[PDB]
């Protein structure tokens, strides 16, 4: 049985898969070709597990998951057996996303719950948590992705149809909101920053209103540029929006049964590939 | 009367569920998918054993020999890697790659072979073994050579087309013309001799000797004719037009033949008679091109234009790019690379990298990390080269360590640091350190 897994994730070396469904269990597998042997099952959530996500192997084998029970549970494999090592749910509602940061930031994490909040839970020397939260979206937050950099930043998809870009600041100690963008007519489902350290910066924000806006910012100055992928609605609301590493390609998990794939051409506009 | 039931547990979840969805907006038409570390996708697949599918992102890269490690080894023997002057990361210093090379790995029949072949004929440097008294003469001899190769090749292609047409010609003089279309002066001359067209036969022998005297004489005869000449055979005039040296470029023009022969068949005419000596292969080919537009989507056509555009090859390259896809990602990279490493032409640090990325990627997507690493080096941007190499070296250190063809690999010039560094992290993740 498994009629509905809400999220799955791949480890840096893609050898261990971590799928999490509604029955509140997170199933760990040992992937290989056509055989992904079940190696674990992890129960400890009081609601459907929305998303799972490993951390850079530079921190052992850590997997921070967010479930419906308003709580985010950090896990960890220890000598062959997992163990909920810590927890952080200073959020008054269902936790939606949870995405670690680039390992050059330490072991930071990023949670986005319905209480219009998003925290940056770092792990101190004792392994203990030191949260520095910030209110992000009034009517709730559906997602929030990090940004690879070399002055840190992350994007946040909300319920009030916004897409914010926060930036860490020493003078504030808590990420200072610098830019927000509008262009959707329904809960900005998922938002994503791209791992392309090329000329500019790309961000594909999928939504409920069945559109995908691409925020391409020339550089550290000229504000973003709105560009509805295609100018027609997809036959059903869209959910996920993930970038590829090598290739700046975009995959869209539209709530219509297949994932489209859009690439950028010399026209600056995007075209389907696949 | 409304009743009370104590087994209302199977109806508590059902309604407690529908409650969760709608407050979330989670519509029964849910699908998730994000790009893999090892660039590929996983999407909710309710028919496997995990609810996800290990999707092998389809490869845009379609060219057999690339999935062979033999090719890549031999292709590295041709490079000379030097560490950057702004970081210890590799980056090609010398390349001896030539379109010529890749020919052994293709069918001498595939249209692909034709692209690579012609691209060689026109770009790969030609060598002249016999020493020349003077070096300006060498230049001259090298041109006849290349012109001779190019002209002989075009005849291979138009071959059947023309032979077919000769099969049906019901007129002698018309065939005499057709043979000239195949660049066979002697057979034309012979047929002429045999068909009682003796005078014509002598004139034909001139075809190939850019003799300007004969050139102007022919035009003169043509003029005197189209200024009265109550009647002159439709083909005899075509043959004279050819002796004139500018068969389209004129007033009795063979341009109308544009709809009877291959655009290539006609280009041959210009290249064979057109005034070989006074022009360069480039400006001459350009000359022909300026008279006829070619099919936007034709590749062997795109090459000729790139070859002819000599002065602004890049400008055109970009233009070509934003208009057709005849030139694949691999080719475009290989092309820019040879021309760069051979002085043949010039390209932007950026256009040369843009082309490299594109291939470095299409290659990673095919799981060919070794090969995709190699390519990565040709990057001019040290910053990007570094990042790109590193990122991939670690994220894959495993596979890049089995065979010696995998050895020569990290042996490219991958930094000592970066190799063991990634290697370390392959251990604190696997649990067996030092």
């Amino acid at each position: 049985h498994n009629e509905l897994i809400h999220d799955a994730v791949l480890d840096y070396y893609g050898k261990r898969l971590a799928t999490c469904s509604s029955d509140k269990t997170i199933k760990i597998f040992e992937v290989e070709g056509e055989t992904h042997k079940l190696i674990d099952t992890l129960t400890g959530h009081e609601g459907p597990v929305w998303r799972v996500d490993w951390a850079h192997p530079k921190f052992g084998t850590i997997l921070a998951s967010c479930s419906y029970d308003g709580k985010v549970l950090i896990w960890k494999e220890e000598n062959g057996r997992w163990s909920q090592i810590a927890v952080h749910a200073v959020h008054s509602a269902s936790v939606n996303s949870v995405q670690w940061a680039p390992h050059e930031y330490g072991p930071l994490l990023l949670v986005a719950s319905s209480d219009g909040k998003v925290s940056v839970v770092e792990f101190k020397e004792n392994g203990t948590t030191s949260p520095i939260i910030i209110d992000a979206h009034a009517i709730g937050v559906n997602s929030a992705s990090w940004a690879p950099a070399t002055s840190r930043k992350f994007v946040t998809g909300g319920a009030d149809n916004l897409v914010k870009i926060w930036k860490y600041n020493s003078d504030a100690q808590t990420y200072v909101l610098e830019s927000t963008l509008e262009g959707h007519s329904d809960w900005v489902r998922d938002v994503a920053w791209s791992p392309t350290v090329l000329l500019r910066s790309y961000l594909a924000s999928v939504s409920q209103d069945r559109t995908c806006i691409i925020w391409t910012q020339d550089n550290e100055q000229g504000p973003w540029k709105k560009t509805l992928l295609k100018e027609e609605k997809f036959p059903d609301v869209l959910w996920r929006a993930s970038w590829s590493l090598s290739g700046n390609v975009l995959a869209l998990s539209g709530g219509d049964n297949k994932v489209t794939l859009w690439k950028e051409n010399l026209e600056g506009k995007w075209e389907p590939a696949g | 009367h409304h009743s009370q039931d104590p087994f209302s547990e199977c109806n508590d979840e059902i309604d407690n569920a529908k409650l969760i969805m709608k407050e979330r907006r989670f519509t029964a038409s849910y699908t998730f998918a994000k790009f893999s570390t090892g660039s590929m996708l996983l999407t909710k697949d309710i028919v496997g054993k995990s609810g996800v599918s290990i999707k092998r992102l389809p490869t845009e890269l379609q060219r057999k020999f690339l999935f062979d490690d033999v090719y890549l080894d031999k292709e590295i023997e041709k490079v000379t890697i030097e560490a950057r002057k702004s970081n210890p990361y590799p980056q090609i210093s010398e390349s001896s790659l030539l379109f010529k090379d890749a020919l052994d790995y293709m069918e001498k029949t595939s249209s692909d072979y034709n692209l690579w072949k012609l691209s060689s004929i026109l770009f790969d440097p030609v060598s002249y073994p016999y020493k020349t008294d003077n070096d300006q003469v060498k230049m001259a001899l090298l041109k006849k050579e290349r012109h001779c190769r190019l002209t002989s090749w075009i005849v291979s292609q138009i071959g059947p087309e023309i032979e077919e047409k000769i099969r049906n010609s019901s007129n002698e003089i018309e065939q005499i013309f057709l043979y000239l279309l195949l660049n066979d002066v002697v057979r034309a001359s012979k047929l002429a001799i045999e068909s009682k067209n003796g005078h014509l036969s002598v004139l034909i022998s001139y075809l190939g000797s850019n003799d300007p005297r004969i050139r102007d004489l022919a035009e003169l005869q043509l003029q005197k004719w189209s200024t009265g000449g109550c009647s002159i055979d439709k083909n005899i005039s075509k043959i004279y037009k050819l002796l004139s040296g500018s068969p389209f470029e004129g007033l009795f023009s063979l341009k109308e033949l544009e709809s009877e022969f291959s655009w290539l068949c006609l280009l041959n005419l210009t290249l064979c008679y057109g005034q070989i000596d006074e022009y360069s292969l480039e400006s001459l080919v350009q000359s022909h091109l300026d008279k006829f537009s070619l099919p936007y989507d034709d590749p062997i056509g795109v090459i000729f234009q790139l070859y002819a555009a000599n002065e602004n090859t890049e400008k055109l390259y970009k233009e070509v790019r934003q208009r057709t896809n005849a030139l694949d990602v691999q080719f475009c990279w290989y092309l820019i690379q040879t021309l760069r490493f051979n002085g043949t032409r010039v390209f932007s640090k950026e256009t040369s990298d843009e082309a490299t990325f594109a291939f470095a990627a299409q290659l990673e997507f095919a799981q060919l990390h070794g090969h995709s690493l190699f390519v990565s080096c040709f990057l001019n941007d040290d910053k990007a080269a570094e990042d790109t190499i590193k990122r991939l070296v670690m994220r894959e250190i495993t596979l890049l360590r089995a065979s010696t063809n995998d050895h020569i690999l990290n042996r490219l010039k991958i930094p000592s640091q970066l190799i063991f560094n990634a290697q370390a992290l392959k251990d604190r993740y696997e649990g067996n350190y030092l």
């Binding site: - | 001259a140 001799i193 009682k196 005078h199 036969s201 003799d211 005869q221 055979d233």
Partner: protein, 419 residues
Amino acid sequence: YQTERFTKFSDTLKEFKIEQDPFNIIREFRSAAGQLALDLANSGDESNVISSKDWELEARFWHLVELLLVFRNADLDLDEMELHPYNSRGLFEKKLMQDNKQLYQIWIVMVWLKENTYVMERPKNVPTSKWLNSITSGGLKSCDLDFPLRENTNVLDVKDKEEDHIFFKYIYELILAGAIDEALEEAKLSDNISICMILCGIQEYLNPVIDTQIANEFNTQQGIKKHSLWRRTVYSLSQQAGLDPYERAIYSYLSGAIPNQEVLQYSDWESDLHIHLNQILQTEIENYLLENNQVGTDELILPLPSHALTVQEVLNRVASRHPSESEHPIRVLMASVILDSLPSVIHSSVEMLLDIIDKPYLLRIVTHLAICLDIINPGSVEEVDKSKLITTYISLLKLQGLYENIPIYATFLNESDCL
């Protein structure tokens, strides 16, 4: 006042031994007899017409003599030519001509032969355009030269054929005379552009850029590459009857072949000798090119005689073909000079003095020639024969009453002390 003559000849002689180069005696010798051939010619008894031509012939004789000796003797071994396989046919021909003095001489002789060839006067009243009558009678479905070839000659109006005749014959006399430029000019201007082009094929390919050693003479490539082909093509064309005999004759010459009977029937010793030497040449060059892999097989369309006669054998055959003219006294000297066996004949005619004394000029000529020979080539004639000649000549300066200048001639011998 003509009986002066011996004046001119001896006259030179003085100015020579009076300036103390030798090639000027002959040069003047020529000019002299030339001036005489004019007098006796201009106005006079129809008996002078005969003694006239014998002076012209004399003139030609000295000319030929000057030409050949200048080259043979004046010769001061210039530099050699180093070619490469990438060089043009044109350079090879040039080289062949520098290196092979034997052959070059043939050229020298042909240049001479042309120099003295007769050419008619430019045809007057030539038609505005070609084959007008046929065009006007309506019947020329096509106006190219190959049209009446392609189907029965009944096509061309008689009047037209009549004019092609005048043209072709004239172009022919022009080619025989060496007037290739007048030839091209006529072709152009008389509306025979096609025939004109054929005349251009005469040159082998040269390209300033590659064939460097002549980047001086030209700035633009010229000449035609597939020459062997051209040659056969022309040759074959020459053989196709249905063409005017003179047109066929032209291609014959151009191919290095011998013109047809109808035309060749009217050629004389010079004409005939000219034709055949042309052939030795044509053949010689092509073989030199075959010997150097400079002829591509594709071009060997037809067979052309590959064996070259020798000047000796040519003269021999041309001889028996024109006995009368062959035999004439001074023409025999022309041949002697050509073959070099000159002293061989001086000594010969000298013994014809021990029917030479019947013909006036001979006794004089042989003498002055012998004089000239030993001046230019000390050792040439046997001291015996000089004497024997001057002797018998000096004795005729007496019978003539001109002891006045016998001293000049005495300058050669110690036997002068007997005068």
